[PDB]
Amino acid sequence: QDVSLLASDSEPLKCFSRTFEDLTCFWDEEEAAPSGTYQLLYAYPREKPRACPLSSQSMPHFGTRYVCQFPDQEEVRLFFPLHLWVKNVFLNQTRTQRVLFVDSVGLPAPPSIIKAMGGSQPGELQISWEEPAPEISDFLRYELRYGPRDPKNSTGPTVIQLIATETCCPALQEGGSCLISGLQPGNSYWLQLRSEPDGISLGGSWGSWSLPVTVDLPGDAVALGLQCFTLDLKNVTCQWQQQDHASSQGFFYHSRARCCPRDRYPIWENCEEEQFSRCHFKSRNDSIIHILVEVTTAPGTVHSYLGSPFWIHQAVRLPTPNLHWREIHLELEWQHPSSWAAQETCYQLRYTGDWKVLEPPLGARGGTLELRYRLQLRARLNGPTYQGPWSSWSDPTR
Amino acid sequence: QDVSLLASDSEPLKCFSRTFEDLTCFWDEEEAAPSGTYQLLYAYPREKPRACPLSSQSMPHFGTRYVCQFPDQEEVRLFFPLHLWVKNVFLNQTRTQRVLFVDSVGLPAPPSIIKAMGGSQPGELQISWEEPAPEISDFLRYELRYGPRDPKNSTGPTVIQLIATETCCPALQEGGSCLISGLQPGNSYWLQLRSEPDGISLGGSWGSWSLPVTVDLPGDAVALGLQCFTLDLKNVTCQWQQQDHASSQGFFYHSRARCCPRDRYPIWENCEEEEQFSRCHFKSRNDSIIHILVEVTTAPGTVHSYLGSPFWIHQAVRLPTPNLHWREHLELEWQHPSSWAAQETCYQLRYTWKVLEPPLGARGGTLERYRLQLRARLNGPTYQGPWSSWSDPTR
Amino acid sequence: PAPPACDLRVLSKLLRDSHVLHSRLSQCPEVHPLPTPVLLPAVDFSLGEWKTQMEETKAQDILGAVTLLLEGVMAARGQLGPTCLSSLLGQLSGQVRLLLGALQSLLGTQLPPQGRTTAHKDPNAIFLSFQHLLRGKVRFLMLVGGSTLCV
Ligand SMILES: *[C@@H]1O[C@H](CO)[C@@H](O)[C@H](O)[C@H]1NC(C)=O
Ligand SMILES: *[C@@H]1O[C@H](CO)[C@@H](O)[C@H](O)[C@H]1NC(C)=O
Ligand SMILES: *[C@@H]1O[C@H](CO)[C@@H](O)[C@H](O)[C@H]1NC(C)=O
Ligand SMILES: *[C@@H]1O[C@H](CO)[C@@H](O)[C@H](O)[C@H]1NC(C)=O
Ligand SMILES: *[C@@H]1O[C@H](CO)[C@@H](O)[C@H](O)[C@H]1NC(C)=O
Ligand SMILES: *[C@@H]1O[C@H](CO)[C@@H](O)[C@H](O)[C@H]1NC(C)=O
Ligand SMILES: *[C@H]1O[C@H](CO)[C@@H](O)[C@H](O)[C@@H]1O
Ligand SMILES: *[C@H]1O[C@H](CO)[C@@H](O)[C@H](O)[C@@H]1O
Ligand SMILES: *[C@H]1O[C@H](CO)[C@@H](O)[C@H](O)[C@@H]1O
Ligand SMILES: *[C@H]1O[C@H](CO)[C@@H](O)[C@H](O)[C@@H]1O
Ligand SMILES: *[C@H]1O[C@H](CO)[C@@H](O)[C@H](O)[C@@H]1O
Ligand SMILES: *[C@H]1O[C@H](CO)[C@@H](O)[C@H](O)[C@@H]1O
Secondary structure: OOHHHOOOOOOOOEEEOOOOOOOEEEEEEOOOOOOOOEEEEEEOOOOOOEEEOEEEEEOOOOOEEEEEEOOOOOOOOEOOEEEEEEEEOOOOOEEEEEEEEHHHOOOOOOOOOEEEEEOOOOOEEEEEEEOOOHHHOOOEEEEEEEEEOOOOOOOOOEEEEEOOHHHOOOOOOOEEEEEEEOOOOOOEEEEEEEEEEOOOOOOOOOOOOOOOEEEEOOOEHHHHOOOOEEEOOOEEEEEEEOOOOOEEEEEEEEEOOOOOOOOOOOOOEEOEOOOEEEEEEOOOOOOEEEEEEEEEEEOOEEEEEEOOOEEHHHOEOOOOOOEEEEEOOEEEEEOOOOOOOOOOEEEEEEEEOOOEEEOOOOOOOEEEEOOOOEEEEEEEEEOOOOEEEEOOOOOOEO | OOHHHOOOOOOOOEEEEOOOOOOEEEEEEOOOOOOOOEEEEEEOOOOOOEEOOEEEEEOOOOOEEEEEEOOOHHHOOOOOEEEEEEEEOOOOEOOOEEEEEHHHOEOOOOOOEEEEEEOOOOOOEEEEEEOOOHHHHHHEEEEEEEEEOOOOOOOOOEEEEOOOOOOOOOOOOOEEEEEEOOOOOOOEEEEEEEEEEOOOOOOEOOOOOOOOEEEEOOOEOHHHOOEEEEEOOOEEEEEOOOOOOOEEEEEEEEEOOOOOOOOOOOOOEEOOOOOOOOOEEEOOOOOOEEEEEEEEEOOOOOOEEEEOOOEEHHHOEOOOOOOOEEEOOEEEEOOOOOHHHOOOOEOOEEEOOOOOOOOOOOOEEEEOOOOEEEOOEOEOOOOEOOOOOOOOOEO | OOOHHHOHHHHHHHHHHHHHHHHHHOOOOOOOOOOOOEEEOOOOEOHHHHHHOOHHHHHHHHHHHHHHHHHHHHHHHOOOOOOHHHHHHHHHHHHHHHHHHHHHHHHOOOOOOOOOOEEEOOOHHHHHHHHHHHHHHHHHHHHHHHHHOOO
C-alpha cells in the first residue's frame, strides 16, 4: 500500500485488486491515531460481517493511514457485491461505506521479466514477457513505453497500445509476445510495460510501469559495408569488410511467411568459411533470408549488425562479360555468358584514353564510342523476373 | 412481397428476413382462390402451432399469391428450427411443409442513401453510405457495381467485393466508407451497392441493388498542363496554361500517411494570385504529401474539376540555372547555386541544338565560335527535382 | 459449418444490446418493485475454483444458468401490465432466448439440475444478472477455452 500505489482516486475508502484473487482496502485520516479505535468490516451477501485485521502507516502529515489485507484463508469471488464499512469501536459511528464489485477494481502488476532483442528487419524490436497472473492473460490490455537513452534524452517517451495478435502481438501464446518496427537502427532504447483490464469483462485501471530494460539494437550493416550476392541461384556467399583489430563472423536464417514471432522465430545458423572476411553456405530458395554479422571489437564484447533481407532470385550475380572493340570513330561489340536473358541485363561501360561512363540500352550487343583507350564493361541484371546487383569488372579492352 | 423479391427460388414456400427481426413467407398457386381456404401455420421446437394472418395478391394469370408477414419480433427467433406447414382447411390437407432456420434466409436491403465524389488521387473514387440496419452491419458483406454514365457503354458493368480491410475501406465505421482506385479519369460514372450476410454465423443471399447514383470523376490535370515546384524548400508555386474565356482557382491540401477518408476528408485551401499563363503560391507544410486541385469555370454556373498527381515537397525542388565557365574539344565548368548536394545534380547541355548529357558527380567536365546551353535537374538519393530553369542561350 | 456460438461477433452484439437496453431502462420512471420475487441464477465465481472445473461442467453450468435466467424473465414479465417495463422485459427475454439458442447450437440440450439459486425483487436485478452472466462465466468459457469447444 505504498505511495506509488496511489493511482486510485475519488473514493473515501479506496480498494484495489492485483491478480483478482487478492484484495486490500485503505483509508487515511488527518487527525491523530488513538490505538484500536477503528475496525474494518466486510461481508459477502450471505455470510455474517467479519472484521479484517488492521495496520497503520505514518503519513508525511500528522495523520495516519489504515490498511486492511484480506486473509489468504478467505477467497474473493468475482461478479459479487461486497459491503465494506469502517466502524469506530468506541462511538459506534460508521466512518465510511462502499459496495464493491471485485471485478470492477483492478491494479494489475507490470510483467516481472522482459526480453528485448533485435528482430528480422534492422528496425524491428521483439518484446516477450511472462505474466504475474497467467489466468487473466486474455482479460488484460497492455501499453508499451520506449525511450532513447541519456543521449537525446530531451525527446519525450512514446507510448503504444499492444492491440492484439492480429498485429503479430499476441498477449497470450506461459507468456505473451510482440514486435515493433520503425525504431532507429543502432541506438539503445530503454523499455517499460503496462497493463489494464479490458472493460468488456473486468474493470480496473493501469498498474505501475515495469523496471526499465535497455536493449541495444543491431543497426544497419552499411556501417561495415555489408554488400553480397548469390551465384546461379544455388549458393549464398557473403563477404564483408573486416573490422580492424576485431574478429568478425556471420550467421544467417531462413523463413517463409512465418510473420508473427510467437516463440522468437529467428534462430541463426553458422556460415561456412574457408582485409575482408567472407562467408558461404547453401540455400533453399523461394524464401526470405536475413543476414547477420557479428564482430568482437574487444575480448568479451561483441557487436551485432544486420542488413536488408535478401531475395535469392532478386540478388543473383551474373558472370562478367567480355567486350570486343572496333574502330575506323570507334565501334563496340560484346556478348554475355549467361544466355538466360539479354534485355534483362543493364550494362555500363567506363572509358578513358576523369573517367566517364555511359549506359547502352539493355540487351544491346554493340555500340559506337568516340576516341589508345581501355574499355571495361559491367553487367547488372534488372529484369522483371530475375534481377540482381552489379557483376565484377572484366579486364580492360583496347 | 413485390415482384423484385423473385430472387428467392428452389422451394415451394419461400421465406426471407431483411433485418433478422422480421419474417415473411409467401407461396403462389395458379389454381382458383376460394376465400378462407389456405391457412399458414408455424411452430418452434416446442409450442402449439399458431396461424399467421394471411393475405392475398393477384397474378398475371388466374392464380393468386399468398403472403404471410409475422406480427412481432417476439415470434422470430434466431438459431432455432422453425417448422412451417400450410393447411388446406377446406379438406384437411397439408399441402406443403418446411423446416427453417431464420438465421440462414437473410435478404438485406441495399443502402438507402449513397454519397460519392472524386478522391485524393486523380483516378480514385471514394464511396460512403449509411446502412439501413446498422445493428447487423458486422455480419454483412458488401458488393459494388459501376459503369459508364455516358450514352451507350464502352464496356459492361464490373462487380467488386469490398474487402472490408484496413486498406482505407472500413465497411463499418452507423455509416460506412470505402476507396476504390483504377477507375478511368475524366468520365461520368454510375454505381450501385448490394449486401449479403456472411455465412460464418448468419446465412442469407444478396439483396436488391440500390438506385444508381451518378458520379463525375474529376480526371487528371495534365490536360491543363499542371506543374508545381518549390524554391529552397520554403514555398510551393504551381502553374497551368490559361484556358480561354474561363477563370480558375487552385486548391491545396496536406495529409500524412492517414490517407483513409472519413466523410469529406480533403480540406481544400484557396490559393493566392501571384505576381497564356497562370500562377499560384502558398506556404507549404513539411514532411508530408500535398495535393493540388485546379477547377475551371468554362461557363457561368458550371465548373470542371481537374486534379494533379500528388508528390512530396522535396521531390520537385526548382533550381535556378547556375553560371557558366567555358573555353575553346571544350572545357566545362559551373558554380552550383545551392551546394548542399552540388555533385549530385544532372547538367544536360546543348552544343551548336542537341548534345549528350554528361553524368553527374562533378562541378565540371569536358565536351568533344559555338553556341551552348545547359539545364540543372536536382537528382539525388535524398532530394529530387524536375528540369527546372533551363539556362538562357550561352556562347 | 461451425456453430454460431463460436463466432465472437454474436457475443459482442449480445453485450452491446444488453448494455443499450439497461441504459434505456433508466428512462422510464414507473419502475417499482415486483409484486412477487423471481428466481435468478448464480453468476459469482472465483478463479481458483474456476481453474479446477472441467470444460463439461462449465458448459452444463452455463446452460443451466441461461435456462433459469430465461425462466425467471418469463415469470417476471407476467407480473406487469401494458407498461414500459413489460416491453423492456419482452426485449430482454428475446435477447436471452437468442443467447440460449446460440449456446444450445454448440453445447447440446442436456440441461443439468437446477443448482444453487437466489431471489430478487427489483426489476434492475434481472438486467444486472443478465449483464453479469454475459460478462462473466460465458465469456470466460468462450475465451479461455478457445478451440476446445469447437475445432
Ligand atoms: C451500534 O448501533 C446499532 C444501530 O443502532 C445498534 O444495533 C448497536 O447495538 C450499537 N452498538 C453499540 C456498541 O453501541
Ligand atoms: C555450394 O558450395 C559448396 C562448397 O562451398 C559446393 O560443394 C557446392 O557444390 C555448391 N553448390 C551447391 C548447390 O551446394
Ligand atoms: C529454386 O532452385 C531450383 C533449382 O535451381 C529452380 O528449379 C527453381 O526455379 C528455383 N526457384 C526460385 C523461386 O528461385
Ligand atoms: C384434420 O386432421 C386432424 C389430424 O391432424 C384431425 O385431428 C382433424 O379432426 C381433421 N379435421 C377434419 C375436418 O378432417
Ligand atoms: C522543412 O524542413 C527543413 C529541414 O527540417 C527546412 O530546411 C525547411 O526550411 C522546411 N520547410 C518548410 C516549408 O517548413
Ligand atoms: C510564401 O508565400 C507567402 C504568402 O503569404 C509569403 O508571405 C512568404 O513570404 C513566402 N515565402 C517565401 C520564402 O517566399
Ligand atoms: C489508467 O491510468 C491513466 C493515466 O495514466 C488514466 O488516464 C486512465 O483513465 C486509466 O485509469
Ligand atoms: C510509471 O511511471 C510514470 C511516470 O513516468 C508514473 O506516473 C506511473 O504511475 C508509473 O509508475
Ligand atoms: C551494384 O553495386 C553497387 C555498389 O557498387 C550497389 O550500390 C548497387 O545497389 C548495385 O547492387
Ligand atoms: C447472391 O446472388 C447471386 C446472383 O443471383 C448468386 O449467384 C449468389 O449465389 C448469391 O445467392
Ligand atoms: C439488381 O439488378 C439486377 C439486374 O441488373 C437484378 O437482377 C437483381 O436482382 C437486383 O435487383
Ligand atoms: C525532364 O525532362 C526529361 C525528358 O526530356 C524527363 O524524362 C525527366 O523526368 C524530367 O522531367
